[PDB]
Design a binder for this molecule. Structure first.
Ligand SMILES: [Mg+2]
Length: 747
């Protein structure tokens, strides 16, 4: 009775919108494929529907770091078994990781904590795979770890893990030694068995391991992992991204001068013959012809001298896939220069499943749209179908079903193959009270979208302004066609781009105003939070860098607010266009002059969230005025260290709040249409209520709560955004950090 069964569905983007660093084919069962993401868990392919199914949605609030999937192994002896190395950061933003194991292809999981951290969202996450199953004795697993933890091993099918103390090199390369992100050793890079050196039921004797160490990076054991030696004659100076052993006995290895996924300004490709020990340089480009690492590496299992590699990263005009059908002796490019600047192409891009991937720009030879990709650190050829290719980019999964057209003078048709994947991080959600859109999102990396049919990919990328990330979006409650979004324009690429966008048609079309907040010395870089007055007659912009500014001219000019500290959270009254609210460091503020001046209120007991030791995603502040009721504000957030955590309610414009005693912890608050027989809007919250973490709805102003999610639909650290629907009672829209946006209704 504490729960209400709901149907949870993804708001469809078609492309996914995030980085897919690894795609893993089972070596024994055709059409068994998995995909791992850096912040959004993993997926299993459904061959009958050409779509992906999440195997991570039971990851919840406390174990949120399991959605950083640093490695994944699928069992070739029993294809029902799959394993993941999970954990998101190896710095102070996260705790220790774990090895997860499933006997039902990811439907259910068991977990073994590791005594160190796993880095699903760390540098080098596309190198791999760093978790592998012995293909002759599948109770044996090896894990190549980060931060100097070295090589680890399981002999009980992943239940317990031990360090392989005889492995001689834990890594030496560090990407960002001066930063607090990526200042640890990248560690080991990939592990590859030689299946021919064992038989069924007996441990495979030869194991290759790549290590992020420019001086000596490739190691081999020939006694089942007891002793290790660096391969004689191996090249130095680079970092091997992948090592794949063909049935001809040749080990192919891609190298970059970084671990990726964003860098890579020099690279090589080598092959090593396991019989002779001879190394051959098969780099597709060398010298000044090469300004990029090589990342993805795909062998063709059905034609073992065919292989492909991808640049990482060439950037301009696009990335390159190189294909060889003769063991790397000669390469073909997926595109070539014609009469410069014109190019010729061996591929055709199909983004009909996610048309916004053109970013609202017309394609040219020098600025293609959509691009072949970027951050292409992983490339796969289906081991049971040489015509099927898949690769991840920073935004989607691309693939082809007619790859061999490359070899016969035809055109490889490349299409979005990310159906069912949702990987965006949700910075904001609004559900407009009128018009054809029930949901407009503010997203990282792909800006956000105005959704109409929630099952149809958006057709229109957000442009003029066009930016990577929308940090905040609001609308005028009484004139809902007027709305404002703020982000961070790339003014080196487009010096005239603005970090604020304005719409007068409910988010279909945007324009950029004439100016931005400035303190005489510096113009804001953007981001922060935006709030729109109830009538749309002013904008309040709490910038990320130079404090709070307001505009009475829809952004044509800006003036610094007074009384509200820089970095404050802000919210507009949904009735009184003169009233704004602010919050910073435990103090609540009110403005009654359209955002020009703020005054602290006596509201006490609010958290400061200044606690030392809080991880970046640990604490939240969520503050919203109620549509249709002046001076009605709800406030959620806090933390357990200050012992100030929960849900507060004010009905006197923030002069005082009541802390609801029946809500132990709360992190987000949102509103939706009132229940039948009720006059007050339904409340939607992310909270811990009577010992239960989840998503809750109240139809009686917070007196009683019912859980509307369940243990199979948790979506990790869901402190990003939430709102109900002013036109649909029971409907909730839930943002995530890695699983896109969900919407849910009673079953
Ligand atoms: Mg792969």
């Amino acid at each position: 009775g504490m729960s209400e069964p709901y149907t949870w569905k993804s708001v469809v983007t078609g492309a996914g919108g995030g980085f897919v660093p690894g795609i893993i084919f089972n070596q024994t069962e055709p059409n068994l494929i998995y995909a791992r993401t850096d912040i959004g868990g993993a997926y299993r392919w459904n061959q009958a529907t050409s779509s992906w199914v999440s195997i991570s949605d039971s990851v919840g609030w406390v174990d949120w770091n399991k959605n950083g999937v640093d490695a994944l192994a699928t069992d070739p002896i029993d294809p029902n078994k799959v394993y993941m190395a999970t954990g998101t950061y190896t710095n102070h933003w996260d705790n220790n990781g774990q090895i997860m194991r499933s006997n039902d292809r990811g439907n259910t999981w068991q977990t073994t904590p590791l005594p160190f951290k796993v880095g699903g969202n760390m540098p080098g996450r596309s190198a791999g795979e760093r978790l592998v199953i012995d293909p002759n004795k599948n109770n044996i697993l090896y894990f190549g770890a980060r931060s100097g933890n070295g090589l680890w091993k399981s002999i009980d099918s992943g239940v317990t893990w031990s360090k392989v103390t005889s492995f001689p090199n834990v890594g030496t390369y560090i990407q960002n030694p001066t930063l607090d992100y990526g200042n640890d050793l990248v560690g080991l890079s990939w592990i590859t068995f030689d299946k021919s050196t064992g038989t069924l039921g007996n441990a495979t004797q030869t194991i290759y391991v790549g290590v992020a160490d420019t001086a000596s990076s490739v190691y081999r054991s020939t006694d089942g992992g007891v002793t290790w030696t660096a391969l004689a004659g191996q090249p130095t100076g680079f970092l091997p991204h992948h090592g794949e052993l063909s049935s001809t006995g040749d080990l192919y290895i891609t190298y970059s001068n970084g671990v990726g996924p964003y860098d890579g300004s020099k690279g090589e490709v080598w092959k090593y013959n396991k019989t002779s020990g001879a190394w051959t340089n098969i780099s597709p480009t060398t010298g000044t012809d090469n300004w990029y690492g090589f990342g993805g590496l795909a062998l063709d299992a059905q034609h073992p001298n065919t292989l492909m590699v991808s640049s990482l990263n060439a950037w301009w005009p696009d990335e390159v896939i190189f294909r060889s059908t003769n063991g790397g002796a000669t390469w073909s490019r997926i595109w070539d220069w014609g009469n410069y600047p014109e190019r010729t192409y061996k591929f055709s891009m199909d983004i009909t499943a996610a048309p916004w991937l053109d970013h609202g720009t017309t394609s040219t030879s020098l600025d293609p749209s959509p691009k072949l990709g970027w951050m292409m650190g992983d490339l796969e050829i289906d081991p049971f179908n040489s015509n099927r290719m898949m690769y991840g980019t920073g935004a989607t999964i691309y693939g082809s079903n007619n790859l061999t057209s490359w070899d016969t003078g035809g055109k490889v048709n490349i299409s979005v193959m990310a159906k069912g994947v949702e990987e965006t991080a949700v910075l904001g959600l609004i559900s407009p009270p009128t018009g054809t859109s029930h949901l407009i999102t503010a997203l990282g990396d792909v800006s956000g979208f105005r959704h109409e049919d929630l099952s149809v990919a958006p057709t229109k990328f957000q442009t003029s302004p066009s930016w990577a990330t929308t940090m905040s979006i609001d609308y005028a409650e009484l004139s809902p066609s007027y709305m404002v979004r703020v982000g961070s324009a790339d003014k080196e690429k487009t010096p005239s781009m603005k970090s604020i966008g304005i719409s007068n048609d409910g988010g279909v079309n945007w324009y950029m105003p004439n100016s931005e907040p400035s303190n005489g010395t510096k113009t804001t870089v953007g981001h922060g939070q935006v709030a729109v007055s109830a009538s749309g007659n002013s904008i309040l912009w709490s910038t990320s860098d130079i404090g709070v500014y307001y505009s009475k001219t829809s952004g044509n000019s800006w003036t610094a607010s007074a009384g509200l500290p820089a970095g404050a959270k802000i919210a507009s009254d949904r009735v009184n266009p003169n009233k704004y609210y602010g919050f910073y460091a435990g103090t609540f503020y009110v403005s009654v002059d359209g955002g020009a001046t703020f005054t602290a209120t006596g509201a006490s007991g609010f958290p400061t969230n200044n606690v030392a030791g809080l991880q970046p995603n640990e604490a939240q502040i969520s503050m919203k005025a109620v549509p249709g009721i002046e001076g009605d504000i709800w406030f959620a957030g806090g933390n357990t260290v200050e012992n100030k955590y929960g849900l507060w309610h004010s009905t006197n414009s923030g002069a005082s709040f009541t802390k609801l005693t029946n809500v132990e912890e709360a992190d987000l608050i949102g509103y939706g249409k009132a229940a039948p027989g009720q006059t007050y809007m339904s409340l939607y919250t992310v909270a811990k209520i009577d010992g239960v973490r989840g998503v809750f709805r109240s139809d009686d102003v917070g007196a009683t709560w019912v859980r509307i999610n369940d243990d199979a639909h948790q979506y990790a650290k869901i402190n990003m955004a939430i709102t109900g629907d002013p036109r649909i009672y029971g409907r909730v829209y839930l943002g995530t950090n890695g699983r896109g946006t969900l919407y849910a209704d009673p079953v």
